[PDB]
Amino acid sequence: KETAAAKFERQHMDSSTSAASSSNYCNQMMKSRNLTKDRCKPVNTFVHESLADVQAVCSQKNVACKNGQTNCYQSYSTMSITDCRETGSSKYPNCAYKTTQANKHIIVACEGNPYVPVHFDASV
C-alpha cells in the first residue's frame, strides 16, 4: 500500500535538521518514522538535504548498484547524512542505535515516472 517513492521518503529523508544533533538522534528518528514497529530495522540512513536535491541525484552519475542493477546514481557532491545502526545490545522491542553523522556522496536506485529515488544503496 505505501508506494516505493513514499517509503524512501519516510525511511530516509530528514530535511528538518542539517545534521544529527545528539547521540540519541537515531533512537528518536527510527521510532518516529515507524522503523522499530515490528522489529528493529538493523541499519538505516537519513539524508539532511532538501527533497529536491535528493531527487536530483537521479540525473547525476549513473553507477552500478551493489546488487548488479544499473539504475543507481551517485551524487556529484557530498551531502549531510546520519547512519543509524543497531548496537550489539539492541533487542526488539528495546531497539538501541548508534548515531554516526557524516558528509558524503549518496548512491540511490531510481525508478518510475517521475524518476525518483526508491532505494538507498550506500554512501561514499
The span from the CA of 123 to the CA of 74, in Å, is 9
- 10 belongs to an annotated ligand binding site: yes
For 4, residues 6+ apart whose C-beta sits below 8 A from its C-beta are 111, 112, 118, 119
Q: Hey, which residues between 54 and 93 contact Cl ion (CB under 5 A)? A: none
Q: Is 48 tagged catalytic?
A: no
Q: Hey, which residues between 20 and 59 contact Cl ion (CB under 5 A)? A: 34, 44-45
Count residues near Cl ion (CB under 5 A). Answer: 8
How near is the Cβ of 6 to Cl ion at its closest, in Å?
A: 4
Cis peptide before 114 (omega within 30 of 0): yes
Residues at the interface with Cl ion (CB under 5 A): 3, 5-6, 34, 44-45, 119-120
